[PDB]
Amino acid sequence: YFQSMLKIIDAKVIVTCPGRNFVTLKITTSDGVTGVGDATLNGRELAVVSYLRDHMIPCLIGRDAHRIEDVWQFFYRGSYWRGGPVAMTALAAVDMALWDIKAKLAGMPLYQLLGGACREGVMVYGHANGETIEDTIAEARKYQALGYKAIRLQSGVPGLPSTYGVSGDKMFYEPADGNLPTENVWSTSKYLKHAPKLFEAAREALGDDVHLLHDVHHRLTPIEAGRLGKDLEPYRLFWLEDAVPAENQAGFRLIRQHTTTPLAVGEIFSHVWDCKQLIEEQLIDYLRATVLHAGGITNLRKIAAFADLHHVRTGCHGATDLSPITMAAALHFDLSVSNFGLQEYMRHTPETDAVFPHAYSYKDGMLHPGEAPGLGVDIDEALAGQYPYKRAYLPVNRLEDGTMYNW
């Protein structure tokens, strides 16, 4: 035998909007084996397109496709300016595509390369939202009837025109809805009094077996989050998510000091450095970082092993802005990681599913990555060409006095 080099002979970025924007990388190797990776960065999509097309891809051509770790370190260190959502999301696409290729050459679904199956499927949660508590609870009943064992509840705040998680969309939430960003208004005090009522009513209506989750969406200070967690303790939430802006990781110390409600954070994190203190101080229970926005399978696996030393479990973000390619990768990761916690699942539109055909599927409150070789996913480029990019921004949020705040 000889070392086999499978050269990368081509790599391209495809942009499509089958209901929302998605950016995809497709790598082709010498013998025609291809791999794809998601590179979608909601609301800043084209920055990642240029990062890939104009800078990374020309360095990728002609490389040995087998050298996954080396390529990862090459782009991570070689950019000189290190990390960040654009670079790490661009790197995630490369990593996903190379692991797709690796598993195809091995003749196995990717999870078999990552340690094999640790569970029979991946528990998911869906998204119950409504303008009132009553509407939110009605939506949650539908998720129960659908076999979901875990449900995130989000309700409008009385006295506020809008809040995170509440829209006309039922089976998903699709926030990037402005040709310019939608402006929202916020009151912490109104929200803090209301949230516990939501869960009080929800437990009464829905019973104790179902797992209930809530996303604070970055809107509190640590002492307010400690209070909110404490008020929510009687309802035993599965997690309370993104309670406070987390750049200052020590901010979670006060929360942890004042409540036993479990804490989750990090859908926006792009590297281990965004959560190292959170994890090593046991300040959170679930890490929400994803293969898409934190640098691929390669990096998320490393982070998850670190998390497992500190009683932290995975709770990967799963909003519609992560394409089916991310979902495939995420599911191979979730099926094989020992310290799995929960997987978010917002349904994509039928058009998105058709552009990104995949083997994964839902059954009885669980997703499963399927048994096809590779990620078990691809892009239909002809169909993708029928849905041109359309600019869309995430909303922003301001205080009652106009102060710029967190959405």
Catalytic center residues: 164, 217
Positions 331 through 360 that interact with a copy of itself (CB under 8 A): 336, 338, 340
When binding is defined by CB under 8 A, the residue of 1, 32, 161, 363 that contacts a copy of itself is 1
**241 assigned binding-site residue:** yes
Q: Are 98 and 65 in contact (CB under 8 A)?
A: yes
Positions 135 through 154 that interact with a copy of itself (CB under 8 A): none
Positions 360 through 379 that interact with a copy of itself (CB under 8 A): 366, 370-373
CA–centroid distance for 377 within its chain: 18
When binding is defined by CB under 8 A, the residue of 7, 9, 14, 83 that contacts a copy of itself is 83
**55 assigned binding-site residue:** no
Structure tokens at 63: 């490389």
When binding is defined by CB under 5 A, the residue of 8, 13, 278, 346 that contacts Cl ion is 13
Q: How far is the CB of 34 from Mg ion (least distance, A)?
A: 32
Task: For helices 85-106 and 68-78, give the axis angle rounded to 10 degrees.
Answer: 170
- Is 405 a binding residue for a copy of itself by CB under 8 A? The answer is yes
Q: Which does 17 bind (CB under 5 to 8 A by kind): a copy of itself, Cl ion, Mg ion, none?
A: none
When binding is defined by CB under 8 A, the residue of 37, 251, 266, 318 that contacts a copy of itself is 251
Contact region with a copy of itself (CB under 8 A), list: 19-27, 107-115, 195-203, 379-387: 107-115
CA angle 368, 373, 376 (to 5 degrees): 50
**267 assigned binding-site residue:** yes
Positions 186 through 215 that interact with a copy of itself (CB under 8 A): 189-190, 192-193, 208-209, 211
Q: How far is the CB of 78 from a copy of itself (least distance, A)?
A: 4
Task: For helices 296-307 and 68-78, give the axis angle rounded to 10 degrees.
Answer: 90
Count of positions (residues) in the chain: 407
Positions 253 through 312 that interact with a copy of itself (CB under 8 A): 253-254, 256-258, 260, 262, 268, 270-273, 276, 280, 282, 285, 293, 298, 301-302, 305-306, 308-311
Positions 11 through 40 that interact with a copy of itself (CB under 8 A): none
- How many CB atoms within 10 Å of residue 235? 18
**344 assigned binding-site residue:** yes
Q: How far is the CB of 372 from a copy of itself (least distance, A)?
A: 6
**301 assigned binding-site residue:** no
Question: How big is the site for a copy of itself, counted in residues (CB under 8 A)?
Answer: 125
SS3 of the chain: the string is CCCCCCEEEEEEEEEECCCCCEEEEEEEECCCCEEEEECCCCCCHHHHHHHHHHHHHHHHCCCECCCHHHHHHHHHHHCCCCCCHHHHHHHHHHHHHHHHHHHHHHCCEHHHHHCCCCCCCEEEEEEEEECCHHHHHHHHHHHHHCCCCEEEEEECCCCCCCCCCCCCCCCCCCCCCECCCCEEEECHHHHHHHHHHHHHHHHHHHCCCCEEEEECCCCCCHHHHHHHHHHHHHHCCCEEECCCCCCCCCHHHHHHHHCCCCEEECCCCCCHHHCHHHHHCCCCCEECCCCCCCCHHHHHHHHHHHHHHHCCEECCCCCCCCCHHHHHHHHHHHHHCCCECCEECCCCCHHHHHHCCECCEEECCEEECCCCCECCECCCHHHHCCCCCCCCECCEEEECCCCECCC
Site string for a copy of itself, 228-247 (x = CB under 8 A): --x--x--x-------x--x
When binding is defined by CB under 8 A, the residue of 222, 296, 315, 324 that contacts a copy of itself is 222
Positions 269 through 288 that interact with Cl ion (CB under 5 A): none
- Is 401 a binding residue for a copy of itself by CB under 8 A? The answer is yes
Positions 314 through 333 that interact with a copy of itself (CB under 8 A): none
Q: How far is the CB of 10 from a copy of itself (least distance, A)?
A: 16
Q: How far is the CB of 271 from Cl ion (least distance, A)?
A: 11
Positions 56 through 115 that interact with Cl ion (CB under 5 A): 84, 86
- Is 399 a binding residue for a copy of itself by CB under 8 A? The answer is yes
Q: Which residues fall in the annotated binding site for Mg(2+)?
A: 215, 241, 267
Interface contacts to Cl ion, rule CB under 5 A: 12-13, 53, 84, 86, 132-133
